[PDB]
Design a protein around this ligand. Structure first.
Ligand SMILES: [Mg+2]
Ligand SMILES: [Mg+2]
Ligand SMILES: [Mg+2]
Ligand SMILES: [Mg+2]
Ligand SMILES: [Zn+2]
Lengths: 102, 150, 78, 129, 64, 206
RNA sequence: CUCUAACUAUAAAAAUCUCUCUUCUC
């Protein structure tokens, strides 16, 4: 039967969506069922900030923040653990997962 | 009285191709004596061993026999032979075997002479072998020229 | 099974004059002497090695340390 | 200036065989190419942080020899069509570059991101591992 | 080259590995105690112990 | 000195000047040092004893095992391949005469020899089986000081036994020569040999 | 009745399977 009302797409009234490739397995999935992540992280790990800091001209360097958008097929999203299979009435909740860092 | 390796020095050098005889696979790889060399045990790690991942490593070892080898690093302080099996060219293996047949066949006549005259094989090697391997690059071609040209 | 040992007599069971001379020469200059040490010097079978050990301790050539059986401790005179 | 001759690191760290290739400020002239694959055997770890770290130490040594003491480090992932993500080695490579005496300067990311080009390899259902 | 570095463990970061018998720990170098690094040590440990490190720069990762 | 008269006259050398607690009444525990500060506080030269046999509360908890007098630990680890398990008195006599032999050759009051050989024999870089199913391989790791001393002593005693097997030499002598070749950098000792082998494997699988 | 911040990286191969299903009213 209907596992979801939205079919899991989030298309619902758009005719057709262009496909965007999965970042890991190169699956072609519609941009909506193309489970998304904004991986904002430092160009240098938080582990080695000290060594880069002490050996740096331009005191207190900005240390840029690398940006990229990650597109998974849902199969990767299950396996690469970005998403987890949830219980029935827990499929309702769509909010961010309880603010990882606060 | 088997001793006195064919080559110049009393420890093998670095980054060269040799051939060992295999004796044991206990925990990490093969500690193997050398019949290309004197008597010294050298290590190969199972990572430096198998080109293809294998179920039973023994099918690629065949304990007791002779196998291709490469010495990369040599502990020239107390004696250790960093050696591998997979670190040899596909063609140069035959060069290794042919080198070994030359050296072994040279060893046989020197052993015969030593067991006849009861001079230690090292002395007969010292007087005769390496001057030949120096003048002509090998004792086998030295013997080949000696049979025809004295 | 097979003759894998290839071990010779490796020692002497009966002391000759030459080996008597040898042990009497090396009675000094040896810091530690045991039945196994006397075996190490390819001179004695081992059964008579104890005989020799008792033989050396008659004019105080070697003083003993501990007199336990199955292993003896001997150190050269000073 | 403080008599520092600026170099350019231009790190390339794919999922395999990280690259550390110091070049002059002009970028046109090359210095001390040694990569990850040169410093490890197993070929399992062409991109390993340890392979990258020896490669970076060697390039730093050659920079000492030639005389380049300050380096402009450039991180360049595979980018374009293939996964656009940094490799597992370039980070240890830059850590080694900073550690080995060299004075760092102006880290930047130059990985080429296309504007919808070149439908990439794998088919539609993609790598079916 | 004998870079044997003595690093005191100050905080053990649980136990890791598929085996479950190796522990990630925070070792700080005895000289210049302002630098800390996480590395894997195998065998029982507790804080205040001082490990030996042949190298100094292999930062650790969770072992799988 | 200090002659004390008793109806049961304990021997003179056992009554005379023993405010000097000594391992076997011969080898002075004082002025014995550990060169490598890494492994200190895991060898118990701090508490002298009069015999290498004291069965206490040593395994019930996590780290009471590390508080054993190191000579106790060597004795205890010597009774392996124990078809003769138990017979610890045999181990005590064996280690006593090993100490005597160490005192004879290269006098060097034997407790310092024991400590030095134990320090050398422990590997400081080992491996762990990481390769999961696909590419079976080992990966490098450091060794905890407790386990470092543990392996040092295990390799020392096992090398002594291997030297003993089907050999004229008494186990006392094999253990003494193992200690001698381990105190210095002598690669001839089996224990230091396997120490270097494990360290080499770790270096090969960094 | 007042708040907008960081974080990691796994997919070796695993095919097959035969019985026999037997009751509820004070
Ligand atoms: Mg269904
Ligand atoms: Mg969805
Ligand atoms: Mg195809
Ligand atoms: Mg799958
Ligand atoms: Zn995918």
């Amino acid at each position: 039967p209907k596992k979801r009302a939205s079919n899991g797409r989030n298309k619902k009234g758009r005719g057709h969506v262009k496909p965007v490739r999965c970042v890991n397995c190169s699956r072609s999935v519609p941009k909506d069922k193309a489970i998304k992540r904004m991986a904002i992280r430092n160009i240098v790990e938080a582990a080695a900030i000290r060594d880069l800091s002490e050996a740096s001209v331009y005191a207190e360097y900005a240390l840029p923040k690398t940006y990229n958008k990650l597109h998974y097929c849902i199969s990767c999203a299950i396996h690469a653990r970005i998403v987890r299979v949830r219980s029935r009435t827990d499929r309702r909740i769509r909010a961010p997962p309880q603010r990882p860092r606060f | 009285t088997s001793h006195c390796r064919f080559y110049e020095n009393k420890y093998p050098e670095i980054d060269d191709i040799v051939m060992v005889n295999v004796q044991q696979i206990a925990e990490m790889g093969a500690y193997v004596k050398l019949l290309e060399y004197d008597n010294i045990e050298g290590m190969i790690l199972l990572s430096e061993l198998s080109r293809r991942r294998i179920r039973s490593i023994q099918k690629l070892i065949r304990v007791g026999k002779n196998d291709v080898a490469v010495v990369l690093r040599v502990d020239k302080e107390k004696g250790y032979i960093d050696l591998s099996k997979r670190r040899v060219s596909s063609e140069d293996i035959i060069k290794c075997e042919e080198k070994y047949q030359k050296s072994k066949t040279v060893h046989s006549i020197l052993r015969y002479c030593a067991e006849k005259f009861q001079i230690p094989l090292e002395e007969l090697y010292k007087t005769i072998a390496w001057p030949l391997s120096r003048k002509f690059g090998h004792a086998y071609e030295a013997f080949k020229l000696s049979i025809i040209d004295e | 099974s097979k003759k894998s040992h290839k071990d010779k007599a490796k020692h002497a069971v009966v002391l000759d004059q030459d080996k008597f001379d040898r042990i009497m020469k090396e009675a000094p200059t040896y810091r530690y002497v045991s039945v196994s040490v006397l075996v190490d010097r390819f001179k004695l079978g081992g059964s008579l090695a104890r005989v020799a050990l008792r033989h050396l301790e008659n004019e105080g050539i070697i003083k003993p340390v501990s007199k336990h059986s199955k292993q003896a401790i001997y150190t050269r005179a000073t | 200036d403080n008599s520092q001759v600026f170099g350019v690191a231009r790190i390339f760290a794919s999922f395999n065989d990280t690259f550390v290739h110091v070049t002059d400020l002009s970028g046109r002239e090359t210095i001390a190419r040694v990569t990850g694959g040169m410093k490890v055997k197993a070929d399992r770890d062409e991109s390993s942080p340890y392979a990258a770290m020896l490669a970076a130490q060697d390039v730093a040594a050659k920079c000492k020899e030639v005389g380049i003491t300050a380096v402009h480090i450039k991180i360049r992932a595979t980018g374009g069509t293939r996964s656009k993500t940094p490799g597992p080695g370039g980070q240890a490579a830059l850590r080694a570059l900073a550690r080995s005496g060299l004075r760092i300067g102006r880290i930047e990311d130059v990985t080429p991101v296309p504007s919808d080009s070149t439908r990439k390899k794998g088919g539609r259902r993609g790598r079916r591992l | 080259k004998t870079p044997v570095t003595l690093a005191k463990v100050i905080k053990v970061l649980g136990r890791t590995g598929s085996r479950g018998g190796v522990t990630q720990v925070r070792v700080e170098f005895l000289e210049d105690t302002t630098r800390t690094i996480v590395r894997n040590v195998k065998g029982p440990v507790r804080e205040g112990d001082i490990l030996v490190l042949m190298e100094s720069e292999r930062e650790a990762r969770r072992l799988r | 000195f200090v002659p004390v008269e008793l109806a049961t006259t304990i021997p003179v050398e056992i009554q005379q000047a023993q405010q000097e607690i000594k391992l076997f009444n011969k080898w002075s525990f004082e002025d014995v040092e550990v060169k490598d500060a890494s492994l200190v506080d895991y060898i118990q030269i701090s508490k002298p004893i009069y015999v290498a046999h004291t069965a206490g509360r040593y395994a019930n908890k996590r780290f009471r095992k590390a508080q054993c007098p190191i000579v106790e630990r060597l004795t205890n680890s010597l009774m392996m391949n124990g078809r003769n398990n138990g017979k610890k008195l045999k181990a005590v006599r064996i280690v006593k005469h090993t100490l005597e032999i160490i005192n004879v050759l290269t006098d060097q009051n034997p407790l310092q020899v024991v400590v030095d050989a134990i320090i050398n024999s422990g590997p400081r870089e080992d491996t762990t089986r990481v390769g999961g199913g696909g590419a079976a391989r080992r990966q490098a790791v450091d060794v905890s000081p407790l386990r470092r001393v543990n392996q040092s002593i295990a390799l020392l005693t096992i090398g002594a036994r291997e030297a003993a097997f089907r050999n004229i030499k008494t186990i006392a002598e094999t253990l003494a020569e193992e200690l001698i070749n381990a105190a210095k950098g002598s690669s001839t000792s089996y224990a230091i040999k396997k120490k270097d082998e494990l360290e080499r494997v770790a270096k090969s699988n960094r």
